Amino acid sequence: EPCGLMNHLTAVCEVVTQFVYTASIPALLCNLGVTPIDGAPHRSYSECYPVLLDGVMVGWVDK
Amino acid sequence: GGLTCASAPQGTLRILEGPQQSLSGSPLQPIPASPPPQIPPGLRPRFCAFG
Numbered sequence: 267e268p269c270g271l272m273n274h275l276t277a278v279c280e281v282v283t284q285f286v287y288t289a290s291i292p293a294l295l296c297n298l299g300v301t302p303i304d305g306a307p308h309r310s311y312s313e314c315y316p317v318l319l320d321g322v323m324v325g326w327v328d329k
Numbered sequence: 330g331g332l333t334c335a336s337a338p339q340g341t342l343r344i345l346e347g348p349q350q351s352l353s354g355s356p357l358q359p360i361p362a363s364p365p366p367q368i369p370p371g372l373r374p375r376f377c378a379f380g
Contacts, residue, residue: 296345297345297346298345298346298347299343299345299347301343306341306343308341308343
């Protein structure tokens with residue numbers, strides 16, 4: 267009765283449990299080439315990727 | 330003496346900082362592959378018949 271519903275992790279698999287700052291990441295993504303949600307994407311909003319980081323949309327790295 | 334709109338910019342520059350790619354070496358494993366199980370040298374029979 268529990269088939270396919272009760273699974274088990276492989277030996278190498280693991281759950282993430284650490285918590286980090288993730289505050290300097292939005293400022294690094296912009297150095298890398300992302301353009302903030304505020305504007306000037308430099309393309310057409312259709313040739314651009316919507317960047318998300320943990321629910322918060324940094325916004326529109328060029329394609 | 331106030332601020333007025335000036336001429337439209339003629340171009341835009343977007344700066345980002347980027348490093349480059351190295352050569353493809355693809356060094357897959359320290360001791361690589363699945364090394365095969367194998368024969369211990371000589372071994373010898375560890376059993377004899379009676380008589």
